[PDB]
Amino acid sequence: MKKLYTSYGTYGFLHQIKINNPTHQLFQFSASDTSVIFEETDGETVLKSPSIYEVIKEIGEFSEHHFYCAIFIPSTEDHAYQLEKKLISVDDNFRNFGGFKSYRLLRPAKGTTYKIYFGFADRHAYEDFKQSDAFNDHFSKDALSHYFSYFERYLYPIK
Protein backbone atom coordinates (compact mmCIF):
# COMPACT_ATOMS: atom_id res chain seq x y z
CA MET A 1 0.00 0.00 0.00
CA LYS A 2 1.42 3.40 -0.99
CA LYS A 3 2.17 5.76 1.93
CA LEU A 4 3.65 9.16 2.54
CA TYR A 5 6.16 9.75 5.35
CA THR A 6 6.86 13.36 6.57
CA SER A 7 9.67 14.37 8.99
CA TYR A 8 10.50 17.79 10.51
CA GLY A 9 13.79 19.16 11.79
CA THR A 10 16.44 21.79 10.95
CA TYR A 11 17.66 22.15 7.30
CA GLY A 12 21.00 20.48 8.22
CA PHE A 13 19.40 17.57 10.13
CA LEU A 14 17.05 16.68 7.27
CA HIS A 15 19.63 17.31 4.51
CA GLN A 16 21.96 14.75 6.16
CA ILE A 17 19.09 12.15 5.83
CA LYS A 18 18.75 13.13 2.22
CA ILE A 19 22.41 12.63 1.33
CA ASN A 20 22.82 9.47 3.44
CA ASN A 21 20.00 7.77 1.49
CA PRO A 22 20.61 8.51 -2.18
CA THR A 23 18.51 5.49 -3.45
CA HIS A 24 15.38 7.02 -1.88
CA GLN A 25 13.41 9.81 -3.52
CA LEU A 26 13.22 12.34 -0.73
CA PHE A 27 11.81 15.89 -1.28
CA GLN A 28 13.04 18.56 1.16
CA PHE A 29 11.56 22.08 1.61
CA SER A 30 11.70 25.23 3.75
CA ALA A 31 8.57 26.14 5.80
CA SER A 32 8.32 29.29 7.90
CA ASP A 33 8.47 27.31 11.14
CA THR A 34 10.70 24.32 10.31
CA SER A 35 12.42 22.41 7.51
CA VAL A 36 10.30 19.52 6.09
CA ILE A 37 11.21 16.28 4.23
CA PHE A 38 8.96 13.50 2.68
CA GLU A 39 8.99 10.38 0.52
CA GLU A 40 6.16 8.43 -0.98
CA THR A 41 6.57 4.67 -1.39
CA ASP A 42 4.91 1.34 -0.95
CA GLY A 43 8.16 0.01 0.65
CA GLU A 44 10.27 0.88 3.76
CA THR A 45 10.93 4.54 4.63
CA VAL A 46 14.36 5.82 5.78
CA LEU A 47 12.76 8.44 8.08
CA LYS A 48 12.64 7.78 11.88
CA SER A 49 9.32 8.36 13.68
CA PRO A 50 7.75 10.18 10.64
CA SER A 51 4.05 11.18 10.45
CA ILE A 52 2.58 8.40 8.32
CA TYR A 53 -0.37 8.68 5.77
CA GLU A 54 -1.99 6.37 3.23
CA VAL A 55 -2.27 7.94 -0.25
CA ILE A 56 -6.08 7.97 -0.96
CA LYS A 57 -5.86 9.94 -4.22
CA GLU A 58 -3.06 11.47 -6.31
CA ILE A 59 -2.49 13.49 -9.49
CA GLY A 60 0.99 14.38 -10.83
CA GLU A 61 4.58 13.86 -9.63
CA PHE A 62 6.55 15.59 -6.89
CA SER A 63 9.43 17.92 -7.72
CA GLU A 64 11.97 19.68 -5.50
CA HIS A 65 11.42 22.93 -7.51
CA HIS A 66 7.65 23.20 -6.87
CA PHE A 67 5.78 25.18 -4.16
CA TYR A 68 3.52 23.05 -1.94
CA CYS A 69 0.74 23.86 0.46
CA ALA A 70 0.04 21.25 3.16
CA ILE A 71 -3.51 21.63 4.52
CA PHE A 72 -4.25 20.02 7.85
CA ILE A 73 -7.89 19.13 8.25
CA PRO A 74 -8.93 18.15 11.77
CA SER A 75 -11.77 15.74 12.22
CA THR A 76 -13.18 13.11 14.67
CA GLU A 77 -13.62 9.34 14.69
CA ASP A 78 -17.28 9.81 13.75
CA HIS A 79 -16.81 12.37 10.96
CA ALA A 80 -13.67 10.87 9.37
CA TYR A 81 -15.35 8.40 6.93
CA GLN A 82 -17.75 11.04 5.64
CA LEU A 83 -14.90 13.61 5.34
CA GLU A 84 -12.90 11.20 3.27
CA LYS A 85 -15.77 10.43 0.81
CA LYS A 86 -16.45 14.08 0.38
CA LEU A 87 -12.78 14.99 -0.41
CA ILE A 88 -12.78 11.96 -2.82
CA SER A 89 -15.75 13.22 -4.82
CA VAL A 90 -14.42 16.74 -5.53
CA ASP A 91 -14.42 17.75 -9.18
CA ASP A 92 -11.02 17.18 -10.66
CA ASN A 93 -11.19 20.38 -12.72
CA PHE A 94 -8.66 22.17 -10.52
CA ARG A 95 -6.07 20.11 -12.29
CA ASN A 96 -6.40 22.54 -15.21
CA PHE A 97 -5.95 25.75 -13.19
CA GLY A 98 -2.93 27.93 -14.02
CA GLY A 99 0.25 26.60 -12.43
CA PHE A 100 -1.21 23.37 -11.08
CA LYS A 101 1.39 20.56 -10.69
CA SER A 102 0.16 17.94 -8.20
CA TYR A 103 -2.39 16.84 -5.65
CA ARG A 104 -2.42 14.34 -2.72
CA LEU A 105 -5.27 13.36 -0.46
CA LEU A 106 -3.76 11.71 2.67
CA ARG A 107 -5.44 9.49 5.30
CA PRO A 108 -3.55 9.48 8.60
CA ALA A 109 -2.20 6.22 10.10
CA LYS A 110 -2.83 7.68 13.57
CA GLY A 111 -5.69 9.87 14.75
CA THR A 112 -8.03 11.86 12.61
CA THR A 113 -6.30 14.88 11.05
CA TYR A 114 -6.43 14.52 7.28
CA LYS A 115 -3.82 16.14 5.03
CA ILE A 116 -3.87 17.53 1.51
CA TYR A 117 -0.77 18.51 -0.53
CA PHE A 118 -1.31 21.00 -3.37
CA GLY A 119 1.74 21.38 -5.59
CA PHE A 120 1.92 24.46 -7.81
CA ALA A 121 4.49 26.39 -9.99
CA ASP A 122 4.86 28.98 -7.20
CA ARG A 123 3.22 30.55 -4.20
CA HIS A 124 1.24 33.05 -6.16
CA ALA A 125 -0.37 30.36 -8.34
CA TYR A 126 -1.55 28.46 -5.25
CA GLU A 127 -2.91 31.67 -3.61
CA ASP A 128 -4.84 32.51 -6.79
CA PHE A 129 -6.33 29.00 -6.81
CA LYS A 130 -7.16 29.31 -3.14
CA GLN A 131 -9.47 32.20 -3.91
CA SER A 132 -11.44 30.40 -6.60
CA ASP A 133 -14.84 28.79 -6.01
CA ALA A 134 -13.32 25.36 -6.82
CA PHE A 135 -11.15 25.80 -3.71
CA ASN A 136 -13.44 27.82 -1.44
CA ASP A 137 -16.37 25.55 -1.86
CA HIS A 138 -14.39 22.28 -1.33
CA PHE A 139 -11.07 22.62 0.57
CA SER A 140 -11.49 25.75 2.80
CA LYS A 141 -12.06 25.86 6.55
CA ASP A 142 -15.66 26.97 5.89
CA ALA A 143 -16.22 24.16 3.33
CA LEU A 144 -15.04 21.44 5.68
CA SER A 145 -16.10 22.70 9.11
CA HIS A 146 -19.14 20.36 9.23
CA TYR A 147 -16.63 17.60 9.73
CA PHE A 148 -14.60 19.30 12.57
CA SER A 149 -6.68 23.91 14.25
CA TYR A 150 -7.26 23.76 10.50
CA PHE A 151 -4.19 25.38 9.02
CA GLU A 152 -1.83 25.63 6.04
CA ARG A 153 1.92 25.02 6.12
CA TYR A 154 3.63 26.54 3.07
CA LEU A 155 6.67 24.54 1.68
CA TYR A 156 9.19 26.50 -0.44
CA PRO A 157 11.93 24.89 -2.63
CA ILE A 158 15.43 25.01 -1.25
CA LYS A 159 17.87 27.48 -2.85
CATH topology for 1-159 is Alpha-Beta Plaits (3.30.70)
CA distances from 57 to 75, 128, 157 (A): 18, 23, 23
**Closest residue by Cα to residue 133 from 83, 91, 87:** 91
Helix/strand/coil (H/E/C) assignment for every residue in 1-32 = CCEEEEEEECHHHHHHHHHHCCCCCCEEEECC
Cβ pair 121, 132 in contact under 8 A: no
